[PDB]
Amino acid sequence: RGSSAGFDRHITIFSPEGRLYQVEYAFKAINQGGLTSVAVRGKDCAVIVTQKKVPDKLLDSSTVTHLFKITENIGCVMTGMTADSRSQVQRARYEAANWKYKYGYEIPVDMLCKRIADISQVYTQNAEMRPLGCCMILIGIDEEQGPQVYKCDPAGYYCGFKATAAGVKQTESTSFLEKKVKKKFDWTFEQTVETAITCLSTVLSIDFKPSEIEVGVVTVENPKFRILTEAEIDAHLVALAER
């Protein structure tokens, strides 16, 4: 019951309970960022929303982002340690480019997520490096399945979701999103951008300015990953206010 032996808290060897403490500590590392991200998919699109905290006025806020283009058709949001995050983004871009080169078609979102997760698994089994203290959420359109939302973690777990979250208010976001799908017919989100912003606003108790969040979208009609401008975000925040 929380027992330890030897170096089971220093390197990724099993504890008496069969736990990997270093892996568990990597999840704690995600929260050191102090940010929360939300993703939701509908029939028509998939959306990622994250906090944008710019505490320093001397920062060029245009260079502060957690949204990343992996390919033209795949976007992602990164939660956790920033430099670890960027490294995983580069790897995703590499895996996706290499896939296209070898196989002559764009990597499916599920496959890219699986690949990143398989890479993370290695860090949980080999003692000499640490896991990355970050979390990746991928969005894209699949030709057959429609909009996709995938998430992988430092343990090397991955899954597709109707909606998901990451970061500080992950559990509270999951609670909010669960209570909303159970109401919709056929357990499916309809107003997806509105759902994501509302979820994040509730769990944080903020009520955002357009400069305080980032929004990325893929749609069935427009598969190319797109980052909303400040004016585009505002039109959503103004609409969610005037009901």
Partner: protein
């Protein structure tokens, strides 16, 4: 017993202490600042004089990493010099492969990913240095980036590293740098260094100044001696 001996070890609260300890080495260094203005970037360094036996110009903390890119450092200087070499090699390789000058943002990203690679393993230790990269071109305008020991990279209007970072930022925030020329900024940079300089604790320092902008035709250069001396005199008289 301790969770702070290896960069390949997380603490129970999800911290990597070796990276944090390397950042402390930066915090113990004297201050360097970068300010992005209308038509370029200016760098200034409080360079502590440890001995009167040293030559005026010894232990430079300002580097050219490409013809259009300057670098200002704080922390363990040997580590900083090796990062200057990494950056130079990266700029050099980019030109060979792609056939043009490396964009500043791309260089920052590339060097940062190199820095980051040293935060993962027991086989190596994190760099004990932070640095700023500055550049100007007509197409890209003025750009200023800063990288820390963890490998984080962001762009700035104004930036400070070293022991008087917070005090330097306070002064920098008072400037409307976007509207100012490099000529005006060198004076302000000199001023801010003289303000944050702890005259009681650290005795003697040389001011080190460089710039890149329209006035240098996108080439990173040392600020001319005559302009540097004018800035020193202005900073000295302002501190009255």
């Amino acid at each position: 017993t301790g969770y702070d001996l290896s960069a390949s070890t997380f603490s129970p609260d999800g911290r990597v202490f070796q990276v944090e300890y390397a950042m402390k080495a930066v915090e113990n260094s004297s201050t360097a600042i970068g300010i992005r203005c209308k038509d370029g970037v200016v760098f200034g360094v409080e360079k502590l004089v440890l001995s009167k036996l040293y030559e005026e110009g010894s232990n430079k903390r300002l580097f050219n990493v490409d013809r259009h890119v300057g670098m200002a450092v704080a922390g363990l200087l040997a580590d900083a010099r090796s990062l200057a070499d990494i950056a130079r090699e990266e700029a050099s390789n980019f030109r060979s492969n792609f056939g043009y000058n490396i964009p500043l943002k791309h260089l920052a990203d590339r060097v940062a990913m190199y820095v980051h690679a040293y935060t993962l393993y027991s086989a190596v230790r994190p760099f004990g240095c932070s640095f700023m990269l500055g550049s100007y071109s007509v197409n890209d305008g003025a750009q200023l980036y800063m990288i820390d020991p963890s490998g984080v990279s962001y762009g700035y209007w104004g930036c400070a590293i070293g022991k008087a970072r917070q005090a330097a930022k306070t002064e920098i925030e008072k400037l409307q740098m976007k509207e100012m020329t490099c000529r005006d900024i060198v004076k302000e940079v000199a001023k801010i260094i003289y303000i944050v300089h702890d005259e009681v604790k650290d005795k003697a320092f040389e001011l080190e100044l460089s710039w890149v902008g329209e006035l240098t035709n996108g080439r990173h250069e040392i600020v001319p001696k005559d302009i540097r001396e004018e800035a020193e005199k202005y900073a000295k008289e302002s501190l009255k």
